[PDB]
Amino acid sequence: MKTVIQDTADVYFKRKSDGKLVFTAEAQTASFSQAISEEKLRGGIGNKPLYILKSEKEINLTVKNAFFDLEWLAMTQGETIQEETKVKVFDREHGLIVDDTNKVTLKGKPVSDVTFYNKKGLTYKIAVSTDGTYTIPTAFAAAKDKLTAVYQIEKVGRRLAIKASKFSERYEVEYRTIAYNPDTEEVYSDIYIQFPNVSPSGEFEMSLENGNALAPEIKFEALADTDTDEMAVVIEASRDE
Amino acid sequence: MKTVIQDTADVYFKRKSDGKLVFTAEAQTASFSQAISEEKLRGGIGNKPLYILKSEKEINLTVKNAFFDLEWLAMTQGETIQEETKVKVFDREHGLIVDDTNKVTLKGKPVSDVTFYNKKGLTYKIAVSTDGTYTIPTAFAAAKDKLTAVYQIEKVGRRLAIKASKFSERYEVEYRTIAYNPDTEEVYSDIYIQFPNVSPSGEFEMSLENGNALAPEIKFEALADTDTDEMAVVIEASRDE
Amino acid sequence: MKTVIQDTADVYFKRKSDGKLVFTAEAQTASFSQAISEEKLRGGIGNKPLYILKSEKEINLTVKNAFFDLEWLAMTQGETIQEETKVKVFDREHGLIVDDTNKVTLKGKPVSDVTFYNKKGLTYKIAVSTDGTYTIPTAFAAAKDKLTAVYQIEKVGRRLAIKASKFSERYEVEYRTIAYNPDTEEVYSDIYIQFPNVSPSGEFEMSLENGNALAPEIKFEALADTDTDEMAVVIEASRDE
Amino acid sequence: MKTVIQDTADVYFKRKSDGKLVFTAEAQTASFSQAISEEKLRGGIGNKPLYILKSEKEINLTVKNAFFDLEWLAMTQGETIQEETKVKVFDREHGLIVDDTNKVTLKGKPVSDVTFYNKKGLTYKIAVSTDGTYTIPTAFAAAKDKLTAVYQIEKVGRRLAIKASKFSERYEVEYRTIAYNPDTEEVYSDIYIQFPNVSPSGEFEMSLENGNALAPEIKFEALADTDTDEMAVVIEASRDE
Amino acid sequence: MKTVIQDTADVYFKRKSDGKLVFTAEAQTASFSQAISEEKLRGGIGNKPLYILKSEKEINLTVKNAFFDLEWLAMTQGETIQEETKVK
């Protein structure tokens, strides 16, 4: 039956080895381009075309999101996301006033050497302190001035690890979208598109401009199933049955 | 006479093996661009064109509908749509309140392993139960919390399969438009454009962007008829006859 | 957890040899594109795609600041920014009146020859004067005219030098952003994207158009760590733990 | 320190042979783009990178002034602008009326043959007369008509010549801008960008469209100093010192 | 508690650098309008709103008097009014 398709689709994933349902999405795009290389035989009096050669089928996919998830990047590389790992991260503090005795006091727990910046761009890389306070050379600064410090702090959280020898694994995909009946302003069928064997392609650019909202982007490529030789499948299901 | 043509066409298709009138339409575009190769033999004292030889003749097509119809995409891939076939698709259940004994109950008929989701983004996959009651570990969640579930079901509906070896077949096509008389502001003649041998080309894309109406596009390429060497025919017929 | 990212990142830098924390920033762009090569092995009774060969792996970078700091240019070459070095720069003084005796008095300290410009576009390059008062040719101008002069001067400042041989060294970088909670409009995570080993790339342009704000751009190239084989690392630290 | 640059630059030029400070501008653009060539060696189990071959250092400038001065063109050919040179140029007189005796009289001083044009657009070529009174064929015009005249006159001025062999010499260049302090809203530093050796590149174009304020454009190509192997030098002199 | 405002606003000023208490008046209007932006991210089956991006919080003031005073104008251009100057 003729139907009108309006909305985008919900995207699922699944790794063939263990069965990790890697996502339930709320997306902005879904695409399943095709491509076949076609030539044309020719012969006879008058260079007539008599047949069209067709050989080399491909299918590409593309999905695009409006939030950020870390499983997203996890798929493209084949790693696993460790949980609760100690890590090192930089941190900064501002507005540190120097007392009259030429001394200042941090308020954190540095792990590496702390560097100090004045209001002209000079630098001082003093070694980590044991008690909490530091002494300032007179040349760098004087009393009743301001300084800023940068040092490394240890925080706990999740961690991925992009590695240069490992590459992606094999996945399953499926979209789901609705189509209305152009006579009755009702919903009629639930369109699905399954892909039984697909290999993620590593090409992603996370530009992080000012005031914009980042939209990820995964791209796949579909390979032929070895059992029944099916690259893509389309299903329609009536809501009246 | 001189006339002004202003609208699109009604497109008909017809397969040559079984004779299936695969479509009537209400479309948005139609085209049959043509192309030829020229060479300009030169020779003799002074560079002079002696003769211009024509060597090829290509006819393309294009059609663009405003409604989704499964037989369109069925044409370009050879396959014949199967009816009333059992399939496996994903389904999702939201907002489940945990009981006091760390147990939850579903409302469906899972046919694969069930996967649960935490409010923070964990995962826990457990085999299907017979009574529909699943026990959740204490660390995953406690009482008075909300989880979500994902699983597969069995549905009945239509089905296609884009195979990597089976390619299309050969059809007939025909358009039809309406031509006006530029004096009396009336309809004068009906235009027709027939093609007696056509081979659909597999190059199509279905983007499913949010808030955009899907516009299928199906390209063709025509080939010379063996009986009488006609790639196309144009007919004009007045409504006064 | 799904989260939404809006703002840019704070970029940090550090030279692996010395330990000079080259930069804290207030940025406008940040990206870490990837690249991989695919091959499409084929063969069969059609052209069945059997396996994807995946070779090569590169990660680039770019940061686009909103202020100008000389350390940005320091990174792009590797040379150190010398401090308090004397240098020679030009200076011009307008509105020079000719006295009745056909002489002029400068108001500076020339270190080389003085070239004067009259109101028509003539030139006259006198040797540097000792007394400071110059004598203008009678043909160049007359009493009660206006001239312009240009000469060199000695100043003190910082200095960089782009040589044609020296090449870059290796750095460490970190991004940091804030991702929000889509249910409560609070802050949930603090993203980190480390880059344990990077190599500055020589490609940079400084357009100084009229009536514009200048935004430098630096582009890097990421190389695998020699110990661990980790090109880049992503870290998601919750603000609850 | 951190600073914000707003304005364009003042450029200074200088010939290394005779020492003529060839300019002092008020510009609309500037640029000092850079370039490097990179190729990657590969080998081993896994097509891994082992070495990078960095094999150039090219710099180019570009300036776009807001007035027109002939010295700009002088720079791009190396010639010298001669002063007070006799030249021959065309001149056009309109609105001549034919007397009742079939004669017309000019009001200038030709040096070549004079060509007349009539209201239909014919032509009549006559030699230069000694008394200045000329005769018109009766077919060309009659009494009380309107004619126009075009011919050559001798004028004096400045002269330049683009030849087919002469090529450029080597030059010095310098920019200069002003950078503000983002806290107390005042100018802090004075950026400089020196270039110790350049060579003008001949690619210039003067489109003289109607109603556009012409803007010349000059391109250079920086080379390496023989003495110190420096291609560029950057300075920041603070007004507090 | 609940109240009714009927009278105008008496206004005050001050400079941050030298601190001249420039201002008093019996004024006629006063307002401090605010303005914030929105973008309304969307997505999903049905193009629903999911999150609202806010990227500004700006306020601007306005005051009008009934008697002209020079210090008002001086404040805009920042000039320090000279006194006892010979003029033509």
Add this chain to the structure above:
Amino acid sequence: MKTVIQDTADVYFKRKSDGKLVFTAEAQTASFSQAISEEKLRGGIGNKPLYILKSEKEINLTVKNAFFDLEWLAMTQGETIQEETKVK
């Protein structure tokens, strides 16, 4: 002091090349409005304003009399009014 201006302002005009006091008036309206613009560089974690650029200062004038004159139009085009000319 605080003052209350009730009347308009008498106008004077003068060319700078020759120095003709081109006009005098009892007019009805006058004004000397001004105009500037803003650009507000932005950036950072939270798109805050980092610096304000000032790049304009343009002043326009308007004057409106109740009586007509030809010198009035004369300044506008710069043409000198010839006298005692035979006209059709």
